[PDB]
Amino acid sequence: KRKVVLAEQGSFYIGGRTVTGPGKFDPSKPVIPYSNEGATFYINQMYVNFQAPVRPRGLPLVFWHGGGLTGHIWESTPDGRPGFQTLFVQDRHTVYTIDQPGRGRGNIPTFNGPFGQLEEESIVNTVTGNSSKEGAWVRDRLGPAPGQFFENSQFPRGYEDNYFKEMGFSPSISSDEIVDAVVKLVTHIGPCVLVTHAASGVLGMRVATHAKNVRGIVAYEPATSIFPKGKVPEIPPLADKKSQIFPPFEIQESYFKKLAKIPIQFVFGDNIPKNPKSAYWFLDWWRVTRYAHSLSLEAINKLGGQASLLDLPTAGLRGNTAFPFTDRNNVQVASLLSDFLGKHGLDQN
Amino acid sequence: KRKVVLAEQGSFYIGGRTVTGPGKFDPSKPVIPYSNEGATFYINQMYVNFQAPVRPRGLPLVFWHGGGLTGHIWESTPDGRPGFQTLFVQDRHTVYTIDQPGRGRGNIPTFNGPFGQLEEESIVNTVTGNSSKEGAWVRDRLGPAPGQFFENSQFPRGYEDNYFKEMGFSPSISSDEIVDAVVKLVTHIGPCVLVTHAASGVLGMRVATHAKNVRGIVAYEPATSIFPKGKVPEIPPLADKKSQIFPPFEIQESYFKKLAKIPIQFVFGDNIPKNPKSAYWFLDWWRVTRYAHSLSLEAINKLGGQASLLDLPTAGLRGNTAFPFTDRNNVQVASLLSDFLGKHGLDQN
Ligand SMILES: COC(=O)c1ccccc1S(=O)(=O)NC(=O)Nc1nc(C)nc(OC)n1
Ligand SMILES: COC(=O)c1ccccc1S(=O)(=O)NC(=O)Nc1nc(C)nc(OC)n1
Ligand SMILES: COC(=O)c1ccccc1S(=O)(=O)NC(=O)Nc1nc(C)nc(OC)n1
């Protein structure tokens, strides 16, 4: 199970832009402490890793981590089992894993001065946000409250420290620039499949509307819904009568219709409630967010699309968290992804 | 040259601690926007990647990136040629690559509030520092001034953007906590060899004094010298008669002596002046820094050690930058590393 044979592997940077400080750089002056004077800074670039099997079959897969994560989540599970990178190289796909701008080996744009500030220009905000262990516990549906596990959980229990250590903050890089970096990657690699997760769900949908090389999307637990501009359906508030899900992203209809041209599958784990759950904010949030996604997929299908929602429990898999690709049954989750790729010929040359 | 057969690969997090916000966490209350209330945050953990060959020989190698870098520099060169990770898995060594705390997939400790601040506790500074392209150009001795190459350069010209894109800031995590994470990794791995670079040179020396499992060190272009406490020799200022090199790190003699028990090699590239060069601050800085390191190695040898300085031009390799392991002749640089490992019995089981 662990052996893997690579025809080649590597990593590279792509995308981003440059910003400049004032003045001129004098090489005879002390270079350290570092100065903005005469400075050119590369910002908002993305890190990309690839592993290619011998004699690949079908399209390369681009695995895109969720919010506050990195490509680590596709490399290994918290308890050290093979991640989807290894499983799909073994399945004879070339596999790209990214650290998007602002995360991991992607660029964090900061300079000499308060965080994110280049002289008088605010590239990203100095004030950050970041989930706690407790927030992530309920966000990812390990259980209804920190320390608790749902019955039949597939979380790798005992490896909580490993799991939460993989998570961190994201600077306020614009989503436009994150999407731009991945569009450039898709141009670089050719026809490919995007496999997204939570926060990258809506970003991957956006990439597909700008990049015809995206030939399919599988989105694990996408966090933000997407609709044609002015056609967002009625979406109820949460059971606490006061909160709402994330404002759906709206794109022009001519771009939205590009989503009807490729196979798209949204995948959800277990323990999303059917009924309002006022006592558990993030469980109720997932209920209404999944509902909004069902309407988004229906809108894609009314325009001639091939969009579907897979609830893992209906496929016979019980207990998955919001990271099904690192849960204890991730091999079975991978099998369902192989099934999708095979159904649409994305595993053939 | 590109193929690699892995018995296993993966990644994991190790080291770090936790800090806590005030108050308690209520799962019924809105979890987003994220709050410090009731929060546990994992901070200062390190990312570790490993690739293991079939039938490994000798000790595992731990590759430790320089300042503002990540394990990318061991994966691939800026122009896409195999890095030392691939070369030494092919040489039948298990290879670990790290993103140290505060870099890449390592943790950047920030919360909900101004960067690095947890309520009124400053975990890392809000004001950052970061090299420009211009500062890094002369730091790494691509040439004497930005945009200019030494005639003999081994840099992969044309891939400047790719190269500079791999560099970024480091938050003010204490060096103690960075050393702590790698000591914990070395305890987990068992006997190994540290391969360090620039800023991680002094940190690897410190790790060796705390971890008998470190059985050898090869340091490329180390940036800070180390001496026994109270025994720093006379080191001249730079040619501008105002600047100094980095204040040498001082450790108790009992720990310093541990450096005499293992083979240690410092490796320097080309274009470091023999004579004072006041027009080019970083060239002169490298002259005096290399001199300080020569005295450091001499001090280890006077304690019965086996500490050597390898200037790559004396081995027939001309024009290397301060990243010899990603230069155009990196295969030849690797050969010299294999020779060190072999001579010292580190390539046998
Ligand atoms: C892995 O888990 C998630 O990925 C994840 C999963 C579920 C919800 C949220 C996230 S997230 O933390 O990244 N945030 C996100 O998708 N975007 C977003 N949108 C708005 C409008 N506000 C905020 O506030 C943070 N975030
Ligand atoms: C994921 O499920 C829970 O999280 C969960 C849910 C409810 C209770 C307990 C757990 S548990 O997992 O902590 N522990 C558990 O189940 N213990 C247990 N021990 C014995 C000795 N026998 C039996 O059952 C016969 N159960
Ligand atoms: C890849 O290049 C290097 O590794 C590298 C190479 C040569 C010099 C500097 C660096 S560095 O930028 O990271 N900084 C470093 O080693 N430590 C350090 N120590 C002091 C006392 N001040 C500062 O200020 C920056 N830094």
What are the structural domain ranges in chain A? 1-349
> Which residues, including other chains, have CB under 8 Å from residue B140's CB and lie 6 or more apart?
B321, B322, B323
Both tokens of B121, joined, read 């506790």
Taking the C-alpha atoms of residue B219 and residue B225, their distance in angstroms, rounded to an integer, is: 11
Taking the C-alpha atoms of residue B324 and residue B333, their distance in angstroms, rounded to an integer, is: 7
Both tokens of B236, joined, read 């001249």
Inter-chain Cβ pairs, chain A and chain B, closer than 8 A: 260
Taking the C-alpha atoms of residue B284 and residue B276, their distance in angstroms, rounded to an integer, is: 6
Three-state SS at B285: helix
Exposure string over B327-340, b if 16+ CB within 10 A, otherwise e: bbbbebbbebbeeb
Taking the C-alpha atoms of residue B202 and residue B226, their distance in angstroms, rounded to an integer, is: 7
- Tokens 């939205």 belong to which residue? A256
Contact A17, B164 (CB under 8 A): no
Contact A21, A39 (CB under 8 A): yes
Taking the C-alpha atoms of residue A281 and residue B30, their distance in angstroms, rounded to an integer, is: 6
The angle formed by the CA atoms of residues B179, B183 and B187, to the nearest 5 degrees, is 170
For residue A318, which of A279, A260, A272 has the smallest C-alpha distance?
Answer: A272
Kindly state the DSSP code that residue A215 receives in the 8-state scheme: E
- Tokens 């008088």 belong to which residue? A120
DSSP state letters, A84-97: HHHHHHHTT--EEE
> Which residues, including other chains, have CB under 8 Å from residue B202's CB and lie 6 or more apart?
B222, B223, B224, B225, B226, B249
Residue of A nearest to B284 (CA): A28
H runs (alpha helix) in chain A: 72-75, 84-90, 133-139, 160-165, 175-189, 200-210, 253-256, 281-302, 330-343
- Asked whether the beta carbons of residue B116 and residue A116 sit closer than 8 angstroms, the reply is no
Taking the C-alpha atoms of residue A55 and residue A239, their distance in angstroms, rounded to an integer, is: 52
**Cα dist. B204→B62, B187, B197 in Å?**
10, 14, 9
Three-state SS at A9: strand
> Which residues, including other chains, have CB under 8 Å from residue A120's CB and lie 6 or more apart?
none
Taking the C-alpha atoms of residue B268 and residue B322, their distance in angstroms, rounded to an integer, is: 7
H runs (alpha helix) in chain B: 72-75, 84-90, 133-139, 160-164, 175-189, 200-210, 253-256, 281-301, 330-343
Please report the atom of ligand 3 found closest to the CA of residue B69: 1
Candidate of B175, B224, B249 to mutate for ligand 3, largest count of ligand atoms within 8 Å of Cβ: B224
Give residue A319 CA to ligand 2 midpoint distance, Å: 14
Q: Residue B33, exposed/middle/buried by CB under 10 A (0-12, 13-18, 19+)?
A: exposed
Contact B106, B99 (CB under 8 A): yes
Exposure string over B173-210, b if 16+ CB within 10 A, otherwise e: beeebbbbbbbbbbeebeebbbbbbbbbbbbbbbbbbb
A127 vs B contacts (CB less than 8 Å): 113-115
Contact A170, A102 (CB under 8 A): yes
For residue B97, which of A180, A79, A105 has the smallest C-alpha distance?
Answer: A105
DSSP state letters, B158-188: T-HHHHHTT--------HHHHHHHHHHHHHH
CA dihedral (B111, B114, B117, B118) positive or negative: negative
A135: distance to nearest CA of chain B, Å?
A: 6
- The resolution of the experimental structure, rounded to one decimal in Å, is 1.5
Bridge partners, residue B267, by sequence:
B220, B310
A133 vs B contacts (CB less than 8 Å): 18, 39-42
For residue A115, which of B104, B170, B32 has the smallest C-alpha distance?
Answer: B170
Bridge partners, residue B346, by sequence:
none
Bridge partners, residue A48, by sequence:
A12, A98
> Which residues, including other chains, have CB under 8 Å from residue B180's CB and lie 6 or more apart?
B15
- Tokens 């004098």 belong to which residue? A26
Helix (H) or strand (E) holding A64: none
Three-state SS at B76: strand
Give the residue, by CA position, lying nearest to ligand 3 atom 21: B246
Both tokens of A42, joined, read 């590369």
Nearest ligand atom owner, CA of A144: 2
B170: distance to nearest CA of chain A, Å?
A: 10
- Asked whether the beta carbons of residue A5 and residue B6 sit closer than 8 angstroms, the reply is yes
Amino acid at B168: G
Both tokens of A10, joined, read 């590597």
Taking the C-alpha atoms of residue B281 and residue A167, their distance in angstroms, rounded to an integer, is: 40
Contacts 24+ apart (CB under 8 A), A18-26: A18/A42, A18/A43, A18/B133, A19/A43, A19/A109, A19/A118, A19/A121, A19/A123, A21/A111, A21/A118, A21/A119, A21/B132, A22/A119, A25/B132, A25/B134, A25/B135, A25/B146
> What is the CB < 6 Å shell around ligand 1?
A 66-69, 129, 139, 198-199, 223-224, 246; B 32-34
Contact B278, B293 (CB under 8 A): no
> Which residues, including other chains, have CB under 8 Å from residue B143's CB and lie 6 or more apart?
B137, B149, B150, B153
Contact A27, B145 (CB under 8 A): yes
Give residue A173 CA to ligand 3 midpoint distance, Å: 27
Contact B286, B272 (CB under 8 A): yes
Give residue A157 CA to ligand 2 midpoint distance, Å: 12
